[PDB]
Nucleic acid binder design. Structure first.
Ligand SMILES: [K+]
Ligand SMILES: [K+]
Ligand SMILES: [K+]
Ligand SMILES: [K+]
Ligand SMILES: [K+]
Ligand SMILES: [K+]
Ligand SMILES: [K+]
Ligand SMILES: [K+]
Ligand SMILES: [K+]
Ligand SMILES: [K+]
Ligand SMILES: [K+]
Ligand SMILES: [K+]
Ligand SMILES: [K+]
Ligand SMILES: [K+]
Ligand SMILES: [K+]
Ligand SMILES: [K+]
Ligand SMILES: [K+]
Ligand SMILES: [K+]
Ligand SMILES: [K+]
Ligand SMILES: [K+]
Ligand SMILES: [K+]
Ligand SMILES: [K+]
Ligand SMILES: [K+]
Ligand SMILES: [K+]
Ligand SMILES: [K+]
Ligand SMILES: [K+]
Ligand SMILES: [K+]
Ligand SMILES: [K+]
Ligand SMILES: [K+]
Ligand SMILES: [K+]
Ligand SMILES: [K+]
Ligand SMILES: [K+]
Ligand SMILES: [Mg+2]
Ligand SMILES: [Mg+2]
Ligand SMILES: [Mg+2]
Ligand SMILES: [Mg+2]
Ligand SMILES: [Mg+2]
Ligand SMILES: [Mg+2]
Ligand SMILES: [Mg+2]
Ligand SMILES: [Mg+2]
Ligand SMILES: [Mg+2]
Ligand SMILES: [Mg+2]
Ligand SMILES: [Mg+2]
Ligand SMILES: [Mg+2]
Ligand SMILES: [Mg+2]
Ligand SMILES: [Mg+2]
Ligand SMILES: [Mg+2]
Ligand SMILES: [Mg+2]
Ligand SMILES: [Mg+2]
Ligand SMILES: [Mg+2]
Ligand SMILES: [Mg+2]
Ligand SMILES: [Mg+2]
Ligand SMILES: [Mg+2]
Ligand SMILES: [Mg+2]
Ligand SMILES: [Mg+2]
Ligand SMILES: [Mg+2]
Ligand SMILES: [Mg+2]
Ligand SMILES: [Mg+2]
Ligand SMILES: [Mg+2]
Ligand SMILES: [Mg+2]
Ligand SMILES: [Mg+2]
Ligand SMILES: [Mg+2]
Ligand SMILES: [Mg+2]
Ligand SMILES: [Mg+2]
Ligand SMILES: [Mg+2]
Ligand SMILES: [Mg+2]
Ligand SMILES: [Mg+2]
Ligand SMILES: [Mg+2]
Ligand SMILES: [Mg+2]
Ligand SMILES: [Mg+2]
Ligand SMILES: [Mg+2]
Ligand SMILES: [Mg+2]
Ligand SMILES: [Mg+2]
Ligand SMILES: [Mg+2]
Ligand SMILES: [Mg+2]
Ligand SMILES: [Mg+2]
Ligand SMILES: [Mg+2]
Ligand SMILES: [Mg+2]
Ligand SMILES: [Mg+2]
Ligand SMILES: [Mg+2]
Ligand SMILES: [Mg+2]
Ligand SMILES: [Mg+2]
Ligand SMILES: [Mg+2]
Ligand SMILES: [Mg+2]
Ligand SMILES: [Mg+2]
Ligand SMILES: [Mg+2]
Ligand SMILES: [Mg+2]
Ligand SMILES: [Mg+2]
Ligand SMILES: [Mg+2]
Ligand SMILES: [Mg+2]
Ligand SMILES: [Mg+2]
Ligand SMILES: [Zn+2]
Lengths: 87, 50, 50, 122
RNA sequence: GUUGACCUCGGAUCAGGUAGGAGGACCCGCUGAACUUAAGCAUAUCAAUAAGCGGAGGAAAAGAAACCAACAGGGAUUGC
RNA sequence: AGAGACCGAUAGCGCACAAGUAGAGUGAUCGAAAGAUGAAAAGCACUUUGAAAAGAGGGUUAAAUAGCACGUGAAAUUGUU
RNA sequence: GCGUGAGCCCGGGUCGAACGGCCUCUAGUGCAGAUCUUGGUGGUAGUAGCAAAUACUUCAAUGAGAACUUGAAGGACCGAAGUGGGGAAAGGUUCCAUGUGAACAGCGGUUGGACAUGGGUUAGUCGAUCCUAAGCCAUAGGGAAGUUCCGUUUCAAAGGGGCACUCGUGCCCCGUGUGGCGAAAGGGAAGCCGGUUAAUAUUCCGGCACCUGGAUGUGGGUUUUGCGCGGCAACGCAACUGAA
RNA sequence: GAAUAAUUCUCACGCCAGGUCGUACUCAUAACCGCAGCAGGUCCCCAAGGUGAACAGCCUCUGGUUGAUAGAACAAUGUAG
RNA sequence: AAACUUUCAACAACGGAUCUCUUGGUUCUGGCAUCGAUGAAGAACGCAGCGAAAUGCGAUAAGUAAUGUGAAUUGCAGAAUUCCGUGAAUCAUCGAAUCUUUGAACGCACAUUGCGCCCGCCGGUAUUCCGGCGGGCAUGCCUGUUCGAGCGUCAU
């Protein structure tokens, strides 16, 4: 009766939605994410998988703050306004 | 509901007796406001609103 | 089930606002290559993971 | 109309800016309320109105910060958002005064034996 | 007896500060294999390598002799 | 940022395209296919048969032996003569 | 047409933007096989088959088209441990109305859980929220090169209650003990009847109630020697001071 | 704490307020899991008349279905009776 | 003699080889040194006159200010400027701002849009109750301040 009959009894959930990475990988009883390692302070990452590292490395998101640093560096991290501007 | 009641009074100068709310399947909130019986809702919907 | 939490309710709302065809005027722009919607989902075909 | 221009905003105090902001706000709400059951040339007025609101908020904010910076001039401690933001590492560096100090003994040596300007003939 | 010191140990949403995470191609350490070769196999080899852990920068590390030599003596470190 | 006795869409990176996307797995993880109308849409007005999809005329174009199932259009396999 | 041969050259048709001969240089350079890799296509073949769960028939209407669409009339099955009326887990709009070429419903289709456009979920009383269970994790401390392992009251200086404030600042008591998460079936304050929509209702409308918290005034009760009377009794009565 | 008023009287009546999230529909020979509109699997509440010891089998009421590709013929060999 | 099977050609099918093309890869060489508690990298939810995705942005939301240029955007529509001066644009540049819920993530928690405490202002008869608004409350360690403990210990 292993197989088709036993497959009918599957109506529970081992994993739920993680609060940090968003995948359905948070273990319900252990309360530990199988993907990012929440709630540890560091993020889970291993060198035996290069594919997994590249799926979430820097640059795969929005870069909301880090993408404006090269422009500020080139101009010397200056402050002020251009000469006789209005306002 | 406490914020809805104060806003309607400030905006249109209307009074209510009770307010019911729900959240729609599309993620937005809809509120039912019942006026005091001495004011006609049909009149308000024409003077204010449209 | 009728018992839901607010996080699951929020997810279900977004999944059905993302399930409409493309407007007609998109297909008449210069240098267009989009024909249809390639991410259409149906409750009888593919299961969304929560 | 419903389209204000930043040129005239810069020459006003806060009282005018606040009441202009209020008048712009009520008008935008009314057009939203009566937006349904019709459609026409009022459709672009809402776009002009919400952009006009952004301009007034910007001018109010800028005039406030200028006054605050004048207040904290010649003070030892300033609020965090008025302090310069260079970079975390750039903010921890030794100041130029401290990084260029020397001992008494090495200073006396530079007074009497610095590098010289010289040439060697062929 | 009163009062005043010293030493050690504590409280405070006391005044002012500072660390964690990301990145890790290259750099400084710790810990640590087996497949394989020996026509078998245990010392050996693969290798003071892969995987695991901690710490930095535009370079890091090393560095002004308790050195090399045995000469008619050289003279901090690094690289070809 | 500049280049090459490199590859030319089953090649070159898994990805020349809304690609680490769609999809599979409880999970760690696995992971594609898919480029080319014409110089210019000038992307077929009107009449007629049909319930409609469409057909027959008639038009545009250098070309429809280029009609969006779109450059060229091989073989396996199939229809008529 | 040429060459022993691998091959080379020309005529006819289709087509639309680049290509060759000779001497040197260079290589990811020559396919029938690997139960070879990717893609495409045959014979078999209009073949095997589309046979559990008793079953359909007449008239009319719609429509290009009706066995499996709608009305009426007959004939039947489920037979209250139901093919009935409601829920928990799981799904996520599948719910309602209007309309519709193709594709899907292994026959058909004017019908659809399919396709297009709009609409729909109303609470102080039903739940969650509060409590703890098996269990999980912080704090004091001890291991481990380290990611971290143990430890839950311990070999710890571990709390909370009141009063005025000129106005917070100031006074005075008690002390053995001192965190959180964990149940939509355990524990637990409080709502019933009638009506209403295409689609919600113990939630909307009408009538009639209840619980908790907070302020407070009338009536009544007690006290002229201060905090109620009655009954042998079991006890009764609208009240009828009470800190550590 | 009273002798003219006092009463921190658990008595009657009277004043004010009660925030936040779920609520549609199915729960299965088509809305869940088995690659699917699969004779499999998946926790509960309500429970009529007759025969009969009876929630046995058999017939009926309320409620619900008439849905599983069809038409014609009756050879061998089969499956079921 | 037809039909059927088989072979070749023309035209018509099925399928996407071949030829030519390329806003893409790959390898080498040269220049530079800049993330974060002043809240990063990553995640979620929203924002357009008509948008599902992709790109951009954050309730000031398909963007605001400032500087330069000098007449557009374009699938449709409307409207604005039309270069006087008060200036088109998904333009270029970028020194001033805004920046939802989270995340090392910080009042305690979180499978909950759950439950608290302190200070101030505004309403409801109110220091104590209810509602709205603004500002706050994690841990380890350093320097300083102030309040303390101990017959550890000095003098009087
Ligand atoms: K101290
Ligand atoms: K590399
Ligand atoms: K490692
Ligand atoms: K590929
Ligand atoms: K999946
Ligand atoms: K020509
Ligand atoms: K022609
Ligand atoms: K052609
Ligand atoms: K030819
Ligand atoms: K057939
Ligand atoms: K049957
Ligand atoms: K039946
Ligand atoms: K409630
Ligand atoms: K009420
Ligand atoms: K809840
Ligand atoms: K609550
Ligand atoms: K316990
Ligand atoms: K430790
Ligand atoms: K409970
Ligand atoms: K309704
Ligand atoms: K009285
Ligand atoms: K009495
Ligand atoms: K309901
Ligand atoms: K219901
Ligand atoms: K259920
Ligand atoms: K019976
Ligand atoms: K019986
Ligand atoms: K027979
Ligand atoms: K037979
Ligand atoms: K090619
Ligand atoms: K976006
Ligand atoms: K809780
Ligand atoms: Mg389990
Ligand atoms: Mg100014
Ligand atoms: Mg509600
Ligand atoms: Mg402080
Ligand atoms: Mg670190
Ligand atoms: Mg090897
Ligand atoms: Mg060997
Ligand atoms: Mg061997
Ligand atoms: Mg061996
Ligand atoms: Mg390593
Ligand atoms: Mg750095
Ligand atoms: Mg160097
Ligand atoms: Mg150094
Ligand atoms: Mg020395
Ligand atoms: Mg020497
Ligand atoms: Mg040397
Ligand atoms: Mg190149
Ligand atoms: Mg291809
Ligand atoms: Mg490729
Ligand atoms: Mg092509
Ligand atoms: Mg034609
Ligand atoms: Mg041609
Ligand atoms: Mg074709
Ligand atoms: Mg062609
Ligand atoms: Mg052929
Ligand atoms: Mg061409
Ligand atoms: Mg080869
Ligand atoms: Mg071959
Ligand atoms: Mg061979
Ligand atoms: Mg047959
Ligand atoms: Mg069948
Ligand atoms: Mg059969
Ligand atoms: Mg039938
Ligand atoms: Mg029966
Ligand atoms: Mg029967
Ligand atoms: Mg329906
Ligand atoms: Mg219909
Ligand atoms: Mg069919
Ligand atoms: Mg059909
Ligand atoms: Mg149909
Ligand atoms: Mg649909
Ligand atoms: Mg209750
Ligand atoms: Mg622990
Ligand atoms: Mg320890
Ligand atoms: Mg709890
Ligand atoms: Mg219960
Ligand atoms: Mg009360
Ligand atoms: Mg007592
Ligand atoms: Mg219903
Ligand atoms: Mg049921
Ligand atoms: Mg079934
Ligand atoms: Mg299924
Ligand atoms: Mg009997
Ligand atoms: Mg039959
Ligand atoms: Mg037999
Ligand atoms: Mg942030
Ligand atoms: Mg906001
Ligand atoms: Mg606040
Ligand atoms: Mg600190
Ligand atoms: Zn996670």
């Amino acid at each position: 009766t292993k197989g088709t009959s036993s497959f009918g009894k599957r109506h529970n959930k081992t994993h739920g939605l993680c609060r940090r990475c968003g995948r359905r990988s948070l273990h319900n009883q252990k309360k530990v994410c199988a993907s990012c390692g929440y709630p540890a302070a560091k993020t889970r990452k291993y060198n035996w998988s290069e594919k997994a590292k590249r799926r979430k490395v820097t640059g795969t998101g929005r870069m909301r703050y880090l993408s404006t640093v090269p422009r500020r560096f080139k101009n010397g991290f200056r402050t002020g306004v251009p000469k006789g501007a209005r306002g | 509901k406490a914020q809805i009641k104060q806003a309607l009074k400030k905006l249109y100068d209307i009074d209510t007796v009770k307010i019911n709310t729900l959240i729609r399947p599309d993620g937005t909130k809809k509120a039912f406001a019942r006026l005091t019986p001495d004011v006609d809702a049909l009149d308000i919907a024409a003077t204010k609103l449209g | 089930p009728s018992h839901k939490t607010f996080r699951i309710k929020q997810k279900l709302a977004k999944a059905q606002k993302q399930n409409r065809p493309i407007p007609q005027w998109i297909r008449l722009r210069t240098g267009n290559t989009i024909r249809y919607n390639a991410k259409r989902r149906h409750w009888r075909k593919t299961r969304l993971g929560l | 109309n419903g389209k204000v221009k930043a040129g005239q905003l810069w020459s006003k105090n806060k009282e005018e800016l606040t009441k202009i902001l209020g008048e712009l706000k009520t008008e935008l709400s009314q057009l939203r309320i009566q937006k349904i059951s019709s459609s026409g040339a009022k459709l672009n007025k809402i776009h002009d109105l919400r952009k006009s609101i952004a301009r007034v908020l910007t001018v109010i904010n800028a005039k406030q910060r200028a006054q605050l910076r004048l207040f904290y001039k010649n003070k030892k401690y300033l609020p965090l958002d008025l302090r310069p933001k260079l970079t975390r590492a750039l903010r921890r560096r030794l100041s130029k005064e401290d990084a260029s100090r020397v001992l008494e003994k090495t200073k006396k040596r530079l007074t009497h034996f610095p590098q010289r300007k010289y040439a060697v003939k062929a």
